[PDB]
Amino acid sequence: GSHSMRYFYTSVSRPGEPRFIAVGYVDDTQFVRFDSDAASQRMEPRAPWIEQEGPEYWDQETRNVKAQSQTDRVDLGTLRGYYNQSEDGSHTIQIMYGCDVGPDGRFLRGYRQDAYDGKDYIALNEDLRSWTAADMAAQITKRKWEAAHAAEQQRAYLEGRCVEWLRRYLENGKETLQRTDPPKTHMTHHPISDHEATLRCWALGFYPAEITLTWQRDGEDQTQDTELVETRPAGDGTFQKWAAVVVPSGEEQRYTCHVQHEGLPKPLTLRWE
């Protein structure tokens, strides 16, 4: 019965002010956004249960997300000059951070990691006391953040405010955040040739996105000629996924699809009919 909060910050330079977008999630549910292009220049609600927060909440979230974006904007300019990157190209700083809580509401784990141009730049280690940094400019960052005791401040947030507010969100939005919509399942058949056919096992309308789809043949795990597609959002807060296997013709019923999901009392077992 664990839960997580994650924030995702993206700053993308423009050939002039960079585009900055922040989103907050609880588990697989988005609940806030900020967009530097929007007219409001404010953190905005994106879930029903966050709208009840008062003006001091949105004032503070707006100020803190904007303060980070202003530092990211400067750092983009500094890295541009550090790496002699042309003034017409576009570059990206991303931050992901957040915390995990167990069923008792207490801190389990925290994250804070940054990427430059889609590659790891610096990340707080699991101990929340040391940094892992890439080469070149990030080594300077690591030295600078060690001397500034940044990790202590980042750890304080991840174990304190991050956990405190996650618990509050889980309670205020309990009706939707703590739900488990089980998957609706079925199997399709897609002939390939006289020798082979595809069996596809569908899982639809489930929440949270976490799910495990596996294939067995005569009760033995089946790893060859199998394919999983990336889980995809249906757009209504549920998710979709399918698993496929290539089977010899006539042997379709030797294969079983197995579905595990938090919303299922027992795992499901599907077999072609």
């Binding site: 922040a22 303060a67 890295l79 951070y97 940054d114 947030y157």
Partner: peptide
């Protein structure tokens, strides 16, 4: 609630 201590990278 988002973080509030902002660290310049460079």
């Amino acid at each position: 609630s988002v973080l509030n201590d902002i660290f310049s990278r460079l």
